[PDB]
Design a protein around this nucleic acid. Structure first.
Lengths: 66, 104, 259, 70, 117, 88
RNA sequence: CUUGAGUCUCGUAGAGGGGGGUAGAAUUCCAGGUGUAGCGGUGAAAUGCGUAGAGAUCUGGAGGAAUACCGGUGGCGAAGGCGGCCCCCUGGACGAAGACUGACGCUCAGGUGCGAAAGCGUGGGGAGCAAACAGGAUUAGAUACCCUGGUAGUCCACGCCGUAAACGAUGUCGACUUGGAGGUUGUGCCCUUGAGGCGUGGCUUCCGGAGCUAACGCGUUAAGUCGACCGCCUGGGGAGUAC
């Protein structure tokens, strides 16, 4: 039950923070493709986006850090 | 030539200097017959974690179709400039002119 | 000849996949198993509990016709998913009928809110609706004679996940689950959900528009460990459950049943 | 697993919640894993072995199930 | 000594020994106690009970500071983790936040070799 | 890889029809250009072994093509090797 | 001549390679604050570190190495192998249609290259880990297993080494022979009326038929049915040793 297949997105955006936030943990970790049911191709992209965000301090690497 | 996408983060005390910097950056791009497809001052923004001890910073997005030499130059400038904390020049396939989801 | 080919496309034309065409004739009854034959590869092992109406006793003898459902084929040997869901489509059609004249009228009798909306029951089935839907104003059916007779005037429906809150008394008055997972959230919003499969640690009640709930083994009852959930509740049945916990991230809404 | 006790929330309940959060995180498990160095080979082996086991559980057992026990 | 209303309890829970340290909110330690210090050795001090008693001791030690509110930070794997916090609660502080602060590297340093037993 | 425009140019010059592209000579030329390009790269990056494998393969292919040309039609081959400046 | 082989067009996914940047977590050390008697470790201990203020805790700094989550009997690579993020240079694979070349092919003794880990050379680096070494245990002994330390080395540059259960213990290339359940990555049509429906390609995991096999098993990714080329075996030891 993938979101990105239905939406039909060409590429996942690191700037689209809200969307990312659904796929990240309360502890900051990226959520598995088993749980979200994201398609494999998209999942990787999502992960990459998240990573990018983390570099730009848009998303946090973890809950504890400060 | 090659469609880059740049996002740089300025120190929040230098927020009034930002426009000038942006202008300068644009100018350089223009110089080598480089187009600038979108440009979005995101403004002051709360950081997810405190980079270099400070909690807010001033984000500027900028999409550019420029030659790589100029990109390199820009990068160099960023690295030496102390106002800009982070940058992230990042290649892209197309021009991507439509606005960002956080501006909208 | 092409008699058979034409007969095949004919028989394709005179059946469909869901429980739509009331076709299976009840050809053997024995407690506790009904069985039909809707022009499928095999006969259904029907429960008796998809066919007794509103007070417990059976209603249909030999020859009687209800459609069942489909789109699932062969678990080893056999054919269907149950006809009772069939019924849900009919209920949906009546609810939809409202749209035409902007008023579906039956009887709705709603005594109380498990999760903020009085429960309304139509015919055999009982549904849960959001708190406003029960009363047109601030009248509140707590002062009304218990389990009173009105109809249901619809207040709110969730259109994907099936929750419908309907309008008792006052006759005169006339990606997708996981972003905004804050509706049934706040601590203990009770829900009516059909269980799906009980995995010897769990029960997997999950109804609210493409989610997954567990009610695992620890609550379920007021005995902890010796319980074995297949003995204690059911298979395929709409029950008392509420959230107790949501993680919108690692999609594990951890419902409960000891409440 | 950062948590804040809600207004008029019991202590025990809070503790339980915290525990749950911890479990979700898989923090303890992670710690256990990083106690000692696992050779890459060993890590590989476990992963594949585990996978194999899972597969066995899923299919062979299902086949068994088809036939009644008594 | 200056009295303080709110502070932190740091619970360092190892496999061998629990260490409870009550501090002010800024970082400055007020008191501490350990399962090894509480009169438990080897088998005994690596237990929940031991941890609890250490916690209790710690609480007793920071009586003079007059601490009412308390946020707990739990570190490491151990028995003294749930037990310790329970003990603290019993001792009678309003537990405000319960945080986990185990140091998880993001694959950094090589751990020591696996024991052959 | 070789840029599209460059490739096109190469095809036009050596290919008789200019739409042909698959002419032996044309192919050889294409290979040769690529090899030349990669020389610069490999001067810089001596440990890039994987990449060098591809280059080697290309070279081999070119050689094969040349050989084929030789047996078929000598004059053409000679011309080609004059144009490209291939010692053999 | 165009079916093999290759070239061109447009896309596609990728831990493929080389180079240069950078990010965050964690360990270690240094400086300082708070604080007070233990810490650490084990099966149990002790060596060890601690009132010369350790351990704990907070602040600041240094430096190195590796990249949690994603992450998968997932992907890429001839094999060895390859995993944060960004850029530059760069090799291959696959699909979609066309267009072209016209057997240009397959295999390969010698030959040439690439080739984990350890190891060697010269110059750097050195956090963690740790052969050697030392002490403490255990023991009849313990030149081990366990504990506390700990140097080569691991890291980088450029050379050499040329081996591994370098394994699918299965040479490469091509053709042909019943099925099922998946994964991954394209792509054509179809009301995408929805996460779908019907195909068609590539790579891939498991089960199983005929057949094959000493049996175990293999089974369209063959260990089946055949062809082409090469490599290799001829009882165990002596020996992959001596010269």
């Amino acid at each position: 039950f993938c979101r990105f297949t239905a939406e039909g997105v060409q590429e996942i955006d690191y700037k689209d923070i809200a969307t990312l936030k659904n796929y990240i943990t309360e502890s900051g970790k990226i959520v598995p493709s088993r749980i979200t049911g994201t398609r494999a191709k998209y999942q990787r992209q999502l992960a990459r986006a998240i990573k990018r965000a983390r570099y730009l301090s848009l998303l946090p690497y973890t809950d504890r850090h400060q | 030539m090659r469609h880059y996408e740049i996002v740089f983060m300025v120190h929040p005390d230098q927020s009034e200097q930002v426009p000038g910097m942006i202008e300068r950056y644009t100018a350089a791009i223009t110089g080598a017959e480089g187009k600038i497809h979108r440009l979005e001052d995101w403004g002051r923004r709360q950081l997810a974690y405190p980079i270099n001890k400070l909690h807010k910073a001033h984000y500027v997005l900028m999409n550019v179709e420029a030659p790589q030499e100029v990109i390199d130059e820009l990068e160099t400038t960023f690295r030496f400039n102390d106002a800009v904390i982070r940058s992230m020049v990042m290649r892209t396939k197309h021009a991507v002119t439509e606005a960002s989801p956080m501006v909208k | 000849e092409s008699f058979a080919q034409l007969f095949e496309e004919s028989l394709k034309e005179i059946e469909t996949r869901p429980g739509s065409i009331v076709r299976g004739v009840v050809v053997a009854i024995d407690k506790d198993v009904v069985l039909v034959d809707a022009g499928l590869k095999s006969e259904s092992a029907i429960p008796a509990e998809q066919f007794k109406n509103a007070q417990g006793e059976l209603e249909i003898q030999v020859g009687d016709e209800v459609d069942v459902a489909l789109d699932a084929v062969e678990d080893g040997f056999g054919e269907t998913l149950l006809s009772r869901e069939k019924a849900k489509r009919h209920e949906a059609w009546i609810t939809l009928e409202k749209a035409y004249e902007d008023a579906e009228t039956v009887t709705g009798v709603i005594n109380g809110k498990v999760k903020g909306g009085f429960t309304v029951e139509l015919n055999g089935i009982r549904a849960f609706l959001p708190g406003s839907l029960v009363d047109v104003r601030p009248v509140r059916d707590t002062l009304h004679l218990e389990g009173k007779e009105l109809e249901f005037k619809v207040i709110k429906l969730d259109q994907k996940r099936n929750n419908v809150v309907v309008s008792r008394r006052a006759v005169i008055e006339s990606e997708d689950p996981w972003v905004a997972i804050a509706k049934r959230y706040p601590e203990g919003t009770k829900l009516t959900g059909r269980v799906t499969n009980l995995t010897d640690y769990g029960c997997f009640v999950e109804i609210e528009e493409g989610v997954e709930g567990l009610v695992h083994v620890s609550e379920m009852d007021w005995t902890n460990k010796n319980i074995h959930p297949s003995k204690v509740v059911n298979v395929g049945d709409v029950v008392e459950v509420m959230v107790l916990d949501i993680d919108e991230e690692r999609r594990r809404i951890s419902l409960g049943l000891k409440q | 697993p950062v948590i804040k006790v809600r207004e008029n929330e019991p202590f025990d309940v809070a503790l339980r919640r915290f525990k749950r959060s911890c479990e979700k995180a898989g923090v303890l498990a992670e710690v256990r894993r990083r106690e000692f160095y696992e050779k890459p080979t060993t890590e590989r082996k476990r992963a594949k072995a585990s996978a194999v086991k899972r597969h066995a559980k899923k299919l062979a057992r299902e086949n068994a199930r088809r036939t009644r026990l008594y | 000594r200056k009295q303080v209303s709110d502070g932190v309890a740091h619970i360092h829970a190892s496999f061998n020994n629990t260490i409870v340290t009550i501090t002010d909110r800024q970082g400055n330690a007020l008191g501490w106690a350990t399962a090894g210090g509480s009169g438990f050795r080897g088998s005994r001090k690596s237990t929940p009970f031991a941890a609890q008693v250490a916690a209790e001791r710690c609480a007793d030690a920071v009586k003079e500071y007059g601490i009412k509110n308390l946020e707990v930070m739990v570190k490491g794997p151990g028995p003294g983790r749930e037990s310790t916090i329970r003990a603290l609660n019993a001792a009678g502080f309003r537990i405000t936040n319960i945080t986990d602060v185990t140091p998880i590297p993001h694959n950094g340093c090589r751990p020591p070799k696996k024991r052959r037993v | 890889s070789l840029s599209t425009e460059a490739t096109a140019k190469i095809v036009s010059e050596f290919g008789r029809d200019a739409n042909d592209t698959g002419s032996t000579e044309v192919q050889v030329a294409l290979l040769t250009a690529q090899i030349n390009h990669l020389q610069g790269h490999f001067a810089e990056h001596k440990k890039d072994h994987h990449s060098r494998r591809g280059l080697l393969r290309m070279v081999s292919q070119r050689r094969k093509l040349l050989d084929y040309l030789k047996r078929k039609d000598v004059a053409r081959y000679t011309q080609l090797i004059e144009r490209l400046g291939l010692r053999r």
